Amino acid sequence: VPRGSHMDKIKIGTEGAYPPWNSKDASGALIGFEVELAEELCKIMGRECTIVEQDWDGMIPALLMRKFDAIMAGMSITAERQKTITFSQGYADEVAALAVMKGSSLESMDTPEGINLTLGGSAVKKTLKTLTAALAGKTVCTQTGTIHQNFLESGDVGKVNVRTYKTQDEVNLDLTSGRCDVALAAAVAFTDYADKSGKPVVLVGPTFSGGAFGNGVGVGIRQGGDDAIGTRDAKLLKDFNKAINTARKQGIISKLAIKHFGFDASM
Template sequence: MKTTIAAIAMLASLIVIAQARAQDQKSLTFATEGAFPPWNAVDASGQAVGFDIDVGKALCKRAKFDCTFVTQAWDGIIPALTVGKFDAIMAGMSITDKRKQVIAFSEPYALTSNYFVASKASRLPELPENTRIDLSSASDSDKAFLQTLKNNLQGKVIGVQGSTNAEAFVREYLGDAVEVRTYDTQDNLNIDLSVGRIDAGLADYSVWKAFLDTDDHATVAIYGPRISGGLFGPGVGIGVRKDSAHLAEELNTALRSIKADGTLEEISYRWFGADLVSD
């Protein structure tokens, strides 16, 4: 009888421990686009890969989450999050005021630097190198340079991935001077740019880098200033539902940890060959 009672007590203890461990190991599903290399892509086996995925895995290891990545088309990724199709978004998504009206964000895990890349066949007027436009500053020099950029692109066809900040920028600042052509993926934009179907495109430098590292880059070149701030936001963050503030804070805690020990920087160099994560 004593042996039976002891066995029952031990079994109960094991159940309690297992339940506690299960609670500690929370399940979390991230959505990514899977068509935005090197931020995110899908490999030959159908698995999501890229900077976003490696950062997500590092965060999950630090926060003791059991994480899964799924792919979701970009134009439906925020609506799918809000209806509970998954728990969070890691898809190279910039933190902006417009998006914050619908969802919440973690702290930035990468910074953004947006550039035009133009077809050399377009023969655009030259612009000074290593210049910047900060849309948040509203300085006279930035306004003047932005006007020069607009004048130089007058009448050109500009490609952007649809439903991105790049599209928002071109329509707001250049829309009455250029023809805007939207694409479902950056890869399709790159194809048209490389063969001269469009004159230029706008995207984050990290996205252009993957394209410029290919043989197709011989027909194109970076054009004009680095553009940041304003509608491009403070950086790239993890999107969560507004009622998931606790999740955002848990992710922030893990994010600060992988920043502090250099893990985040190491992942950045792995995918971009540069530090895109340090302030």
């Protein structure tokens, strides 16, 4: 199928530094849940697939610049991001959590197990008041250009002393070095790291969903338009959603999630 054709090859951008979503093997080849899912979705469509590496900070500009056609990199679906790109339906959930080292004063919290910032209400606002007091006078680290940064900078938990790094591996090491007091990231990121490193990282407070954390992880695609590029982009959105539905019906997304996360993180 020639490039530009109705049914041509799809280039998918991923980071390669975010296990178990996307990572690199010892040979440096890209692996993980999203690599295997991308391949399965493109097989359903009957289109060829190429996976290419892209740094997280530059991921959305790179899509806009046409370095690739789709983002599959653990990217949460948010209304903010929908201002400039669009998403497929979600294929997996990712709850966020605060993490500290064993010994921290935050290990004595009593919050709900989870809160949803879109559903909101008085009990959620009270939990945020508690978190505001818990973070006062502490340093908190997170990955640059994430929902986690957005939340912390929002004022919803007060005026936070935020530290950021380009990659989640740096966040993990800032926390375990003791150089930062608290970190915010996906719960699955902290458990993947706790599992590999053996370091005593502990989740504290409620898990976070909704609001600045969005609603699941989806395929990021350029917004449709009327020029050649734009009608191809509209069709890619249509094809991805059909393929996700088919994969879900066949039990594929669930099976893959268990094979990577150890539990069914799929949507």
